[PDB]
Amino acid sequence: LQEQSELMSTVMNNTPTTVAALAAVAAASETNGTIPKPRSSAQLEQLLYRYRAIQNHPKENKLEIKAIEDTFRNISRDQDIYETKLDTLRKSIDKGFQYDEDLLNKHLVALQLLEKDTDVPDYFGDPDTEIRISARISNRINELERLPANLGTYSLDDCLEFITKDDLSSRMDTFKIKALVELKSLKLLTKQKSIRQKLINNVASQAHHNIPYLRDSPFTAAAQRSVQIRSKVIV
């Protein structure tokens, strides 16, 4: 039940000693399914730091201190292993390789595009695959709609304008317009679809009076000629 978010909620509510998660087998082990080895850089580790620093006062009501300290031992051991491996890795380098430039370009651009979830070109119907497109657009809409409205730039070209304490520079909004062109272009999609239908179903709906090589064929001219035959008058 997200104990690694329950610690964050108890920290941000500023009352963590008053509850202390009721560390028994019935409560502290029901959310764990040891502790699950936190994932973040420090956002789930500083919480463990503060949690141990608050639980130094009771020291016996909470039996889960030992598994947390075992994970501190694991973190210290992994850190010492990485420091020894970084000491050896800087000694295992060849004296000459002369890494190529125009492949370093491609690795940097490819890593940068693979960070922020966009498609990388290689250079090295069916409503199953219709929903898998219409579920990537809701991703982008509900990711752009969580940006703060007070978003603003600071380009490297405001130094040539000498902005005072209150001067209102003229390149402050080169990202918030761009973060609304996407968010409103991804909501006007089923309007340009309905305009493209009215375009194609009135250009292709003639198809034999505008295109020259179709209205000059034998069979099209014969069909258009034969539909215009006025019915025979008996007597």
Binding site: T174, I177, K178, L180, V181, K184, S185, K187, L188, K191, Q192, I195, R196, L199
Partner: protein, 51 residues
Amino acid sequence: ENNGNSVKKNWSDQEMLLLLEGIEMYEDQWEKIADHVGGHKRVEDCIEKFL
């Protein structure tokens, strides 16, 4: 801004934003879209850019 921009078919982000604001406003009425862009663009080019 309010100034006349550069040579046409550039479509700065201000004009794209005001075009999409107009399409959210009126849903039709491309004269009322093309003046809301700024009036220095024709109907026959706002439709060619929204498509």
